[PDB]
Design a protein around this ligand. Sequence first.
Ligand SMILES: Cc1cc2ccnc(NC3CCNCC3)c2[nH]c1=O
Length: 130
Amino acid sequence: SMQEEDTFRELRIFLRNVTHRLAIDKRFRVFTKPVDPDEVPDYVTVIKQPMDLSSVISKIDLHKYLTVKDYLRDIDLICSNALEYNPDRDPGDRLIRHRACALRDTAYAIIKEELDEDFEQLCEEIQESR
Ligand SMILES: Cc1cc2ccnc(NC3CCNCC3)c2[nH]c1=O
């Protein structure tokens, strides 16, 4: 219906805004674009579902997220990919893991503050009805 289309449009607007605020944070530059195959060739073989904030924006615009829960699965994916691929004690690995956890925590915190629970509940109920 028109009302449901409006609901999903508001969701997309909300998610673009959250995603932009993560994307402009200097700490998260490493998560803004797909990993460069030239810089690292073995990433595609180790990480089976690469995810990044530009890909999240593309998915928002393709109507791939019908709930904030589904959006957060991809934010969690960016984080878990980073923890999996960079597990070592070296400072490069520890820096990226700290940033990955910070990205995750920041997204959840923005959502906890600015997502209305009844809005999310509506989204989930429309999704489940389809
Ligand atoms: C997303 C991403 C980017 C990246 C860039 C450069 N290096 C990485 N890993 C190194 C592995 C060896 N230790 C230093 C860090 C990257 N890892 C990523 O997950």
